[PDB]
Every structure is written in C-alpha cells, then in structure tokens.
Amino acid sequence: FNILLATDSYKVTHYKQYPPNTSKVYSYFECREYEETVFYGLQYILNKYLKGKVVTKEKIQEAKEVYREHFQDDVFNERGWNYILEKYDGHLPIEVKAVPEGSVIPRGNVLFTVENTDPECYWLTNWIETILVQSWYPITVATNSREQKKILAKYLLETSGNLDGLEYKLHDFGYRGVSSQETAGIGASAHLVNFKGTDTVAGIALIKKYYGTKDPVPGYSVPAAEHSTITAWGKDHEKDAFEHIVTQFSSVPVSVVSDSYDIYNACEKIWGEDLRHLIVSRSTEAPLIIRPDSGNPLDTVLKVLDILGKKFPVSENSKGYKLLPPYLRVIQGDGVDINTLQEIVEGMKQKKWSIENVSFGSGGALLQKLTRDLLNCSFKCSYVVTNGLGVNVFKDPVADPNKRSKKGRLSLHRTPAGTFVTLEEGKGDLEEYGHDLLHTVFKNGKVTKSYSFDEVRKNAQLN
Amino acid sequence: FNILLATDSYKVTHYKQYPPNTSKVYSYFECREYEETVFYGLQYILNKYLKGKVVTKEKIQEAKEVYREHFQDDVFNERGWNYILEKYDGHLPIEVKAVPEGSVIPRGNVLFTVENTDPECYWLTNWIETILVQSWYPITVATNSREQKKILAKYLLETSGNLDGLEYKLHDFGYRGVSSQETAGIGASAHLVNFKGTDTVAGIALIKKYYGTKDPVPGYSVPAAEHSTITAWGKDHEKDAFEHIVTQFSSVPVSVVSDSYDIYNACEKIWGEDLRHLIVSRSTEAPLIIRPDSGNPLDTVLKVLDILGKKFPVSENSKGYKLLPPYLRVIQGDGVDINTLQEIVEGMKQKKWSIENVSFGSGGALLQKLTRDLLNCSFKCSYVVTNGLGVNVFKDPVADPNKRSKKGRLSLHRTPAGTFVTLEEGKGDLEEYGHDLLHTVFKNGKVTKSYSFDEVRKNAQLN
Ligand SMILES: O=C(/C=C/c1ccc[n+]([C@@H]2O[C@H](CO)[C@@H](O)[C@H]2O)c1)NCCCCC1CCN(C(=O)c2ccccc2)CC1
Ligand SMILES: O=C(/C=C/c1ccc[n+]([C@@H]2O[C@H](CO)[C@@H](O)[C@H]2O)c1)NCCCCC1CCN(C(=O)c2ccccc2)CC1
C-alpha cells in the first residue's frame, strides 16, 4: 500500500530530533503491568506490510507531495528513503526478534524488539512503530478470548467431568460488529487460536494465507435462522418458519432465533408442544440448538432451561447437574462478554445445569470493544547508540510510574522455577539463565521464521 | 476481495428459510433510541465493496469449496449466485436509498434502506446486511467526534468570544490504537468530517479517492516530538533535545512532549528558564506546543498552566479569561474522551483559562472504543412481498421492547416544526409531509449519487 504513509504523521519529522551521531535505536514491545497475554499476530503484519520490496521511486513521490500538502512544508525524509531504494532495493534494514507465536507470556515481559541494521537507517525503527503496534489487537482478541475459555473449561469440567466440545462453546458473531473488513478477518483469526466456531469467514482466508493449517479447516459453523427468516412468514406464523427451518436442516445441527416475539411461548407452546415432535425425532449429531437474543443473559438461560426441562426429558449426569435430551440444546448469542459469561455459568450451576446444555456467542464484546489499554500494550525505545557507545533509555513520568520503561538490551528468559523473566541492561549476555527465547523473525526485508497456525494453537493452550 | 464471503456464515444458509414464493426482501438501517447522528460512510463501503461487477465464475467457485469445509456440506447458493453473473454480468442487483452523506438526523429515524432488485435475488437484500452494517463505525466516530466539537465550541465561545480555531482543537492520535490499517483509514476520515487535524495520513487517501475535497488541506499536522526523540539524548539531556527541536522547527508550530521525566521541571525550569529565550523569540504563526502525556488529565492542564503563567507574560481578555503569550500553547493528548474532555474545559473555566490556550488530542477513545451499541445501530427487515401481496414485518420482543422494529416501507420526511420523522407502513405514500429525503444511491451495481467530502462536512457542520 505505502509504508511511507503507514505511520503517525508527526514521525515523518522525527528523523531530525534524534541526538546527532546516533547510529542505533533499538525499540521493544510489551504489555505493561489479564496477567498473561497470548502473543499472536505479529507474523501477519510482517508478511502483509513489511516483508519484501516496499519502497519505490513512485511511493517516495506519493509520500512527499502528500507529506507536503499535509505539513504545508517539505520535511519528509526523501533523502534517507532512497538510500533504502538505491541500496537494499526497497527492503527495510531492520531486525525483529519476537517470541514463538501463540506463546502465553505473563506481564511486564518483552515480546518483541526492533532495531535498525544500517546506521543510516537509525530513523526507521520507530517509523514502523505504528503499523507494528496494531498487534495490541490480534493479541487482545486472543488473550481476552482465551480467558473466557478457562472460565468455560472449569465450569464444564466441574459440571460434566470433561472438556468434551469445549472448543466450540464460544461462537464469534463479530463480523457485523467490527469497524473494518480487514479487521473482522484479523480478529476472527484471534478466536480460532482458541475456539473453532466462527461466522466471520474472513478469519480463515487470513489463517491459511499467513499461517497455514494442515488440519481439516480452522473454523466452522452451522445453519441458523436470523430475525428476518422468521418474521418474513408473518406475525402469526412463527411456528410455520420454526417448522420450515427444522425439516430443511433436518439434515445437520441447526440454530433458530426464538425471541422474535416472546421467547417463552416459542419455547413452551411452539417447541414444547406443537413442534415437540419434529424434534425428539432428531439425532444427537443434528441437535436443534435454540437461540435467545432477549434481556439479561442469566435470567433468560435459566428460565428457557426451566421451560425445556418441563417440556422435555431431563436427565442428570454423574455430577448431579441436569442435562437435556441429546437432541436439544441452547446458545446465548447476545449479551455475552467475559464479565457476563462467568455470571451465567455460575448461575447455571447453582441451579445445577450442566454447562453443556449451553454454548455461547459474543458479538462486538469479542471482536470490538477491545483497547490497547486493556493490556497496556506499549512500544518504547530501550537502547540507542550515540557516537559509537550505547546508552540505556526509558521514560519515567513522575505523575506516573508503571509507565517506567525497561532499560537497554532486553532478553526474555525462562526461570528455573517455571515462568519467564525479561533481562535488562544487556544483562542477558551473562548466560545466567541461558538462551534468550525471542527469535529473529525478520531481518532485512525477509521473513526468517514463521509458525503454522497449528503451532500457534499448541503454544497458546491451557496446559 | 470476494463478496461471497463478506457475510455471516449462517446467512449462506438463509435462502432456504424464507416463506416460499417470496420475491421482495426490503430492509432498513437505523440508530434505535448521543441523540442525533451523523450519517457518514455508506458511500465508501457502498463503493469499494458493493459497486461494479462483483460476482464471477471463480468467486463462485472459491466461495464454493470454502462454504463446504466450513459447513461440512454444500448449501451455498451456487445456483442463485450464477443468476446474478449470467444475468447481470456480476452486478449485485439491489437498490439502496440513503440520506445525504453527512446528514445529522435524530434517533429512531430511517437512515438507509435496501431491497433486492429482481424477484430472483430476494435473498440478496440481507446477505449484505453485514457489509452494510460495518458502517455504524464511520457514523459513530463522526458522531462522537462531532459532539466533542460542541463541547469545545461552547467553552471557546464562552471564554474567548468566537469559534476561532475550533476545526483544530481535537487532534486524531488514533493510528496506533485502532484494530487494523483499513480501520484507521475509515476512522480518521470520520473525524475530519468534523475537525481538520490528523496524524493519520491513511484517512486522507480514503477521502480523496472516495469523496474528494476541493480543499488543499483536508487534514493537517505539524512536527512533534515523541518519547524516543527525547530520551535518546539521555536521562540528563532532556533539554538539549528540547532546544534541538525548537531550533530545527523554528518556523512552524512544534509540539514537544514534556513528561519523559517530571513534566513540571520541564515546564518550570527547562521551558521557563533554561530555554525560555528560544521561546519568546517565536512568531504566533508558529508557537511552541507543550504536550503533557501522563497524570490526571485535568489536575495536569491546570498546574501546567499555573506553572507557565508564572514563567510567561499572561494577558486577560474581554470575557475575563486569561490567555498566555501568542508564541506558547498546550496540547493535551492522552486520557481524552468525550466525558473527560468536558471535565477539562469546565474545570479550566472556573479557574479562568480560555479554551484557546489548550487544544486536545485523543487516540483510542477517538478511533477505537466505539461500539455498535452506542446509537444501537441496527439493520432490520420491515417489508417483504410473499405470494404477490407483501407484508409489513417487524420484531417485538418482551425482554427489550425497545428492540421493536418498524413496519412496512419507510420514508424520511421533514416536519413543519423543523425536524425529521420516519413514516412507516408505506404510509409516506399519502404524500403529505413532502418528499422522502432519502435519495437513491446504488440501483443495480452502479453508484447513482455520491457526495464530495465538502458537502458532507457542510451537512454535519454545526449549529
Ligand atoms: O448461531 C449462529 C450464528 C448466529 C449469528 C451470526 C451472526 C450474527 N448474529 C448476531 O449478531 C449480533 C451481534 O451483536 C447478535 O444478536 C448475534 O447473535 C448471530 N450460528 C450457529 C452457531 C452454532 C454452531 C454450533 C455447532 C455445534 N454446537 C453444538 O452442538 C452445541 C453443543 C452444546 C451446547 C450448544 C451447542 C455448538 C455450536
Ligand atoms: O502532538 C502532536 C502529535 C502527538 C501524537 C501523535 C501520534 C501519537 N501520539 C501518542 O498516542 C498515544 C496514545 O496514548 C500517546 O502517548 C500520544 O501522546 C501523540 N502533534 C502536534 C499537534 C499540534 C497541532 C496544533 C496545530 C496548531 N494549533 C495550535 O497552534 C494551538 C492553538 C491553541 C491551543 C493549542 C494549540 C492547534 C493544533
């Protein structure tokens, strides 16, 4: 597209504020003290934006002329950009050290770094700060999404004895809830790192093009109804659609919006009586998944379940929690976020309902309403070479610590007792902990190391 | 970009759920009952995505094998999709009416509608409910942004006497707080509808290529300093940079972050003493912008000012509010949102400072941190022709009776008192409120009406 304008405008200017005789600026990324993040997504932005030849006689021309109308002034580093076109044929001379994608590393720890390879390109490092920082996203989607799984995991386990079907308990509805198209895709791929069910198709295009999966396919879905494929039959024909949709999909599992008009009549009257037969006559492989989109995730699940307990044969597992007949289940697809999720399963089990009769779906809570601040994703410079000798750097606002930056050449190590540790001031060169863990993944325009979305899983997974 | 996969998965199933003999699926967009939104963005989505020839022998085949391993079955409409290609040369056939881009309409009114073009593609209307709904974004950024302008407008006028400098008092710093690249593009462009300052160049591209400006500066910015261009000088050389930066950009406004280390020493001794002479010796056409970025956003602006008032020559004015010298101002970018913003100017007023000294900068809150939930952006079906007569549709839960739905064909009119009103039940037809303010903007694959970002701005203009 144009890296020359994939940066925060005021940077086009930074190349003239660095102390003079500076040959190296080394920057690092992190999630400043959710206490362990899933580092996923850097490998996308790299291939799709940095790798390869990225500077051209034409882009240097587009940039200025633009960063000219913009600034009402010629400040753009047109000189130092051709250096890059003339010498490395438009390949950025920067090294990028990161952690294996999917890695679940605690907070305040180094995840990736950026330093320039050529002393004439000292200005480049931070130029790419921006584009590279938008990882706070794939990461937060993944992290926050993975935290809901633990919640799901421990409630299923305690209420059922196992994790059967865990990976299909949170369904991403995000697509219409996101801002871009390019984004719905990136975020859908940050759920699949954890679950397999997704309606955002764009999510997979990404996976198999930037990460690759050897498996059958990264995500899936089933046929369901929406509000129009039901209200289009008429006010007084909810039952006609209900029925026309579960003979069509007699076939496989099928989800049907049951809250067009009162979702207790649809449950009791229509499913528990009229149509009670086009259902018990279904298979455990093709359940009739029921879908409320009402008011109050908790209050509703509990009641709908109460309606269904009364209209169908309820059983009870070796744990004491009630279960529905294998051909009937429920999904909360509206009003579900990490905070409310916990509320539901906890209420479900005080009532004694296997966390299994119910799966969920989250919209924008899952794909939008995520911020860089949620995890303090930050990108700062920790080391610079001025006149040949290096000096550790950082910031320390008085009106606020925690903003305090790490100093010098950082290293990410594995403590003899389990976790990690980021070593500062180049102290990692004394093999006390042995073997930095961040790998080079980018060096002078080429992607020196990628991971398949299969490893990404493995890495970011619950034990 | 294939649009056969720019829809929710389950929607692919949808063509088998409508009441048989359905020929018309007419749907509308709205912001169910921030209380008068700015309608912006449709013209992009509806042009970079739905426009021209969008279906093909291949796109039909690609979306085929995918909606196959995705669904573990073929229920994709390879039949119906080949109509649109073999019949209209891959031109999505649908008619979409909208309101003048930039239009500021109260809530609960129809903003746009979509109804298939031909009896065959009745299913199409909704298919695109997705693509067409990720517009809530361009709208809310524009809406949120616009409000903040009123808050700035009201305190400027009250404290300075005029609206001099409004268009430049809220600077977009979002670029790195947004999900993807395409997001900051779409988003920044939505801030400009309201203001003019942006660090996000990506946004401009979108404007010229999709709306066009006759203006020279659709977006504008000045050279600033970030945390590395200052710390690289060294813990004890914060000041050589301050002065290396106020000399490099001696004849243009320039902003210099001052919270690297204690942002009061910077203001007090460093700017007020050590480098004070490079300051009073600057034109008003290019002042020094001091930029805090840490601490309580209000307590800080107030002390920073109290600190500068003590170092520099402060005047008073016709309204009785104090102003500092022409060559010195403040930019407050950080912890700034619509809520916080107001806490700053009212607090600045009781202390008597004048919104002219200060200008703000928002990043995440400005571009990210917006939800489809504010404004309750919802796209629903209200009319459908089944078996020749067509019925007025709508949903009406009983858990959220706010989630009702309009019935029949809608129309937007202007009331004799001066506001708007959506007439439903095809009722706007008893012509008697004037004409539908909704123009046709898409009929059969071609864009029948675009607007220049100049009209847009002007519609969303204030008061
Ligand atoms: O329900 C949907 C999609 C709903 C949808 C899709 C797109 C958009 N929307 C709506 O957008 C909004 C965003 O705010 C909502 O109101 C959201 O639901 C709704 N797809 C079918 C998902 C079910 C796939 C099942 C396959 C197998 N499966 C089960 O057999 C199961 C097992 C145990 C418990 C529950 C289910 C678990 C999941
Ligand atoms: O300060 C910046 C850019 C800051 C920036 C840019 C990109 C990213 N960031 C960082 O994003 C993060 C999110 O937390 C932050 O740490 C943030 O500081 C900060 N550019 C200089 C802006 C000067 C704009 C002025 C031009 C002219 N102007 C004035 O002369 C003026 C008039 C009255 C009052 C004040 C100023 C009004 C606006």
Side-chain angles (χ1 to χ4, degrees):
Chain A
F1 56 154
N2 204 310
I3 300 296
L4 299 192
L5 4 88
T7 184
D8 303 73
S9 299
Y10 79 135
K11 249 118 88 121
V12 179
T13 70
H14 296 346
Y15 86 97
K16 337 177 60 208
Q17 333 185 343
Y18 277 121
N21 269 319
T22 264
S23 71
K24 185 126 146 116
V25 21
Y26 157 115
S27 290
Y28 82 103
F29 178 96
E30 80 170 324
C31 294
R32 250 166 52 215
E33 323 199 54
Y34 304 108
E35 79 183 49
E36 87 190 325
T37 54
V38 171
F39 177 66
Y40 166 60
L42 169 51
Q43 178 177 297
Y44 161 84
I45 303 166
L46 295 185
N47 287 287
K48 179 180 185 51
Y49 292 97
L50 303 186
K51 95 151 150 177
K53 198 215 180 187
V54 295
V55 202
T56 81
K57 40 248 84 204
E58 296 79 46
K59 318 194 185 188
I60 299 298
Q61 179 60 201
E62 213 199 288
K64 55 139 48 190
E65 148 176 317
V66 169
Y67 287 128
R68 145 50 100 182
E69 162 223 285
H70 197 186
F71 283 110
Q72 287 305 98
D73 165 26
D74 226 313
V75 184
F76 171 69
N77 197 2
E78 176 185 14
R79 192 159 309 183
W81 267 110
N82 300 249
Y83 184 83
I84 301 295
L85 182 61
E86 289 238 353
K87 174 87 80 306
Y88 308 101
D89 208 56
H91 282 199
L92 296 175
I94 64 164
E95 185 170 5
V96 196
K97 307 248 187 168
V99 228
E101 286 243 323
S103 292
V104 173
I105 298 168
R107 288 230 227 158
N109 272 299
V110 83
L111 289 190
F112 76 66
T113 69
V114 182
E115 75 194 301
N116 49 293
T117 37
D118 184 334
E120 231 58 62
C121 294
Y122 69 92
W123 56 273
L124 224 194
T125 304
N126 301 249
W127 179 288
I128 58 66
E129 200 209 291
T130 329
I131 193 107
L132 288 185
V133 183
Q134 306 166 321
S135 304
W136 68 264
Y137 187 70
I139 291 166
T140 306
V141 176
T143 295
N144 176 242
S145 151
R146 178 165 184 289
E147 292 286 325
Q148 282 153 92
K149 203 186 192 183
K150 291 188 197 193
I151 302 300
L152 281 161
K154 102 154 181 140
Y155 264 80
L156 207 164
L157 187 57
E158 152 161 51
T159 256
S160 103
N162 51 258
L163 299 214
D164 288 28
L166 206 210
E167 259 108 289
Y168 293 94
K169 224 105 208 193
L170 223 205
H171 206 262
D172 139 32
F173 292 181
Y175 218 172
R176 72 161 115 296
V178 297
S179 37
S180 315
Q181 263 295 320
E182 157 173 49
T183 293
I186 293 23
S189 82
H191 201 253
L192 306 193
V193 168
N194 317 311
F195 298 74
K196 300 249 233 74
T198 188
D199 246 61
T200 299
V201 306
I204 14 164
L206 199 133
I207 307 162
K208 326 130 80 179
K209 180 201 192 320
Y210 282 91
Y211 292 89
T213 291
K214 285 55 220 97
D215 305 304
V217 141
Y220 304 73
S221 183
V222 317
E226 86 187 328
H227 289 291
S228 68
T229 64
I230 292 291
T231 36
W233 290 71
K235 206 303 179 178
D236 318 290
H237 295 289
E238 199 171 21
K239 170 176 147 299
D240 284 325
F242 268 13
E243 180 166 342
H244 173 76
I245 306 175
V246 295
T247 308
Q248 289 297 295
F249 298 107
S250 48
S251 317
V252 297
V254 64
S255 213
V256 183
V257 288
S258 295
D259 86 331
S260 313
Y261 323 103
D262 182 276
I263 193 158
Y264 291 106
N265 177 276
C267 268
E268 195 162 281
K269 192 144 309 186
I270 320 300
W271 293 128
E273 316 225 26
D274 319 341
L275 264 13
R276 187 200 195 285
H277 65 279
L278 310 174
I279 184 166
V280 186
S281 54
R282 298 181 75 70
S283 44
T284 87
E285 256 215 3
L288 161 69
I289 299 299
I290 279 303
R291 221 184 77 189
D293 171 42
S294 275
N296 182 120
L298 207 230
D299 296 346
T300 316
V301 169
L302 303 183
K303 191 158 154 183
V304 151
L305 277 168
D306 189 38
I307 309 301
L308 301 198
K310 317 196 137 128
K311 271 33 212 52
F312 300 75
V314 275
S315 116
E316 174 170 287
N317 50 288
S318 39
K319 298 291 181 233
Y321 306 100
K322 313 104 88 342
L323 196 47
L324 301 187
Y327 53 62
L328 167 64
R329 307 213 160 309
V330 183
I331 59 167
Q332 245 294 134
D334 161 285
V336 169
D337 53 7
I338 176 66
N339 279 308
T340 285
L341 190 74
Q342 170 67 58
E343 280 171 32
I344 307 314
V345 290
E346 227 306 293
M348 262 209 253
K349 102 170 254 271
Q350 283 166 177
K351 298 271 114 273
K352 300 281 175 9
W353 290 100
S354 229
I355 283 315
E356 5 167 350
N357 319 294
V358 173
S359 121
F360 305 89
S362 165
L366 179 74
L367 264 257
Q368 189 79 173
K369 192 161 195 304
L370 252 13
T371 121
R372 208 176 78 257
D373 263 326
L374 183 78
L375 300 190
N376 297 161
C377 302
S378 216
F379 188 95
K380 265 83 213 193
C381 179
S382 60
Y383 182 70
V384 221
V385 174
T386 285
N387 267 347
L389 70 121
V391 289
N392 306 323
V393 152
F394 59 134
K395 44 178 291 188
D396 207 316
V398 60
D400 176 27
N402 175 68
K403 288 244 169 180
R404 153 195 357 252
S405 308
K406 296 193 176 314
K407 265 178 315 318
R409 285 164 51 263
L410 312 159
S411 348
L412 190 265
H413 308 290
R414 152 83 45 162
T415 62
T419 20
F420 308 73
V421 44
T422 304
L423 285 184
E424 287 186 22
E425 281 153 40
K427 284 163 182 158
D429 276 331
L430 315 164
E431 336 299 50
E432 317 128 75
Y433 292 83
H435 301 319
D436 182 354
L437 316 74
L438 324 197
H439 291 133
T440 280
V441 294
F442 190 86
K443 188 74 160 301
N444 318 277
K446 327 263 70 174
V447 166
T448 88
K449 192 185 201 311
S450 77
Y451 318 79
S452 61
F453 195 71
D454 301 80
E455 322 178 65
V456 178
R457 320 295 297 284
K458 182 100 142 177
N459 259 340
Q461 85 171 51
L462 327 160
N463 9 300
Chain B
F1 173 80
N2 177 340
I3 194 253
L4 271 40
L5 31 255
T7 181
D8 293 305
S9 306
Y10 77 136
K11 237 85 121 109
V12 189
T13 73
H14 286 2
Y15 71 101
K16 321 182 174 187
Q17 310 174 25
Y18 294 113
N21 287 336
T22 281
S23 52
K24 254 294 205 68
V25 169
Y26 160 117
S27 286
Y28 81 111
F29 180 85
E30 64 165 335
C31 280
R32 300 219 319 297
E33 295 176 277
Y34 301 118
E35 69 172 57
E36 61 159 310
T37 50
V38 174
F39 176 59
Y40 172 60
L42 182 54
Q43 189 173 293
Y44 156 86
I45 292 169
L46 203 263
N47 192 316
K48 161 178 180 296
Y49 286 107
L50 296 225
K51 198 216 56 148
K53 201 212 176 179
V54 310
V55 184
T56 98
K57 150 189 61 193
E58 307 78 333
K59 291 196 163 169
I60 297 296
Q61 171 60 204
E62 177 197 351
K64 215 219 167 205
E65 9 188 90
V66 192
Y67 290 143
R68 163 57 241 197
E69 205 57 51
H70 190 230
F71 284 109
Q72 248 35 48
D73 166 18
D74 239 308
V75 281
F76 166 47
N77 205 359
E78 186 192 349
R79 224 142 169 63
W81 268 107
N82 286 212
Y83 190 84
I84 295 73
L85 170 55
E86 189 139 55
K87 225 298 179 51
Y88 301 86
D89 197 38
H91 272 198
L92 262 193
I94 44 171
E95 180 183 19
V96 197
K97 299 207 188 52
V99 236
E101 285 261 321
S103 272
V104 184
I105 292 75
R107 292 174 65 175
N109 291 287
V110 70
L111 294 182
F112 76 64
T113 83
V114 177
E115 91 211 54
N116 62 179
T117 28
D118 139 15
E120 289 299 299
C121 319
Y122 64 79
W123 46 272
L124 215 206
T125 300
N126 263 65
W127 175 291
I128 48 166
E129 180 212 306
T130 17
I131 190 74
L132 297 184
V133 167
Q134 312 182 323
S135 79
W136 63 271
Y137 182 66
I139 285 167
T140 314
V141 174
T143 301
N144 193 262
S145 219
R146 181 152 178 295
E147 284 300 312
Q148 280 159 93
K149 199 183 179 178
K150 295 181 192 173
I151 297 73
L152 283 166
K154 174 203 168 80
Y155 278 82
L156 246 190
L157 181 56
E158 178 177 0
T159 285
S160 118
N162 58 200
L163 300 201
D164 284 30
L166 238 200
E167 315 290 295
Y168 295 96
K169 274 184 188 302
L170 218 203
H171 209 273
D172 156 24
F173 288 5
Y175 213 178
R176 85 172 84 127
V178 300
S179 318
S180 70
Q181 269 299 342
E182 186 186 9
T183 265
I186 311 165
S189 83
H191 184 248
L192 297 164
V193 174
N194 310 299
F195 298 74
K196 274 194 171 51
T198 190
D199 243 51
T200 304
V201 282
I204 262 73
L206 197 125
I207 309 164
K208 301 182 297 200
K209 182 188 192 311
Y210 291 96
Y211 297 84
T213 343
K214 312 323 169 189
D215 231 48
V217 140
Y220 159 78
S221 185
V222 318
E226 61 155 56
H227 284 100
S228 71
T229 53
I230 291 291
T231 39
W233 291 73
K235 170 190 182 68
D236 305 293
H237 301 299
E238 155 147 273
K239 154 182 172 274
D240 301 339
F242 269 15
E243 149 171 16
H244 179 88
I245 303 171
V246 295
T247 304
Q248 289 293 302
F249 307 84
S250 35
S251 67
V252 302
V254 77
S255 110
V256 192
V257 212
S258 308
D259 84 322
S260 303
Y261 323 105
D262 188 39
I263 201 151
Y264 288 99
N265 192 250
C267 285
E268 203 185 82
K269 77 161 289 163
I270 302 166
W271 291 126
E273 315 216 12
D274 311 336
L275 302 180
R276 186 191 143 109
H277 50 277
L278 309 176
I279 308 163
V280 200
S281 61
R282 298 178 76 83
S283 41
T284 82
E285 178 173 293
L288 162 77
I289 289 298
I290 300 294
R291 189 188 92 177
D293 157 53
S294 70
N296 167 284
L298 172 53
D299 306 335
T300 313
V301 158
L302 295 178
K303 196 156 160 189
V304 152
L305 281 171
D306 166 49
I307 278 50
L308 291 188
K310 286 168 163 60
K311 316 315 294 187
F312 302 93
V314 258
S315 47
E316 174 157 291
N317 74 231
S318 350
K319 300 305 181 200
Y321 297 90
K322 2 209 298 302
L323 182 51
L324 4 105
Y327 50 72
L328 156 82
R329 292 302 194 237
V330 180
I331 195 297
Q332 222 292 88
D334 156 287
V336 193
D337 64 35
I338 180 166
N339 292 318
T340 259
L341 197 91
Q342 182 102 45
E343 285 158 27
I344 303 297
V345 297
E346 222 290 301
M348 243 180 128
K349 216 196 66 164
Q350 300 158 177
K351 289 296 150 263
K352 259 76 70 181
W353 278 98
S354 186
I355 321 298
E356 0 186 10
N357 299 300
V358 182
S359 57
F360 310 73
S362 187
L366 205 250
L367 263 260
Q368 195 79 320
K369 244 280 177 290
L370 261 34
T371 303
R372 222 183 77 242
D373 257 334
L374 300 54
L375 316 217
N376 318 141
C377 297
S378 189
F379 169 122
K380 319 103 150 189
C381 177
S382 75
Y383 189 70
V384 85
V385 181
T386 258
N387 270 317
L389 31 284
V391 301
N392 295 329
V393 162
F394 76 126
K395 67 187 287 191
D396 198 339
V398 295
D400 203 12
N402 162 209
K403 271 232 247 301
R404 200 180 311 272
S405 174
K406 307 190 175 300
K407 318 187 202 182
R409 358 199 305 295
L410 320 175
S411 18
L412 216 230
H413 305 280
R414 195 164 254 292
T415 64
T419 200
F420 305 82
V421 50
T422 304
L423 293 192
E424 28 196 281
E425 257 151 67
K427 199 161 299 168
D429 228 313
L430 316 162
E431 263 106 53
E432 59 126 314
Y433 252 94
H435 327 231
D436 187 11
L437 315 185
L438 306 187
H439 307 332
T440 271
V441 294
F442 186 55
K443 256 263 204 59
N444 311 292
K446 254 80 161 299
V447 173
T448 41
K449 182 167 218 171
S450 72
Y451 301 76
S452 60
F453 201 64
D454 310 287
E455 320 192 70
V456 174
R457 271 184 176 154
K458 178 179 185 165
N459 282 329
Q461 91 171 179
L462 231 169
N463 207 36

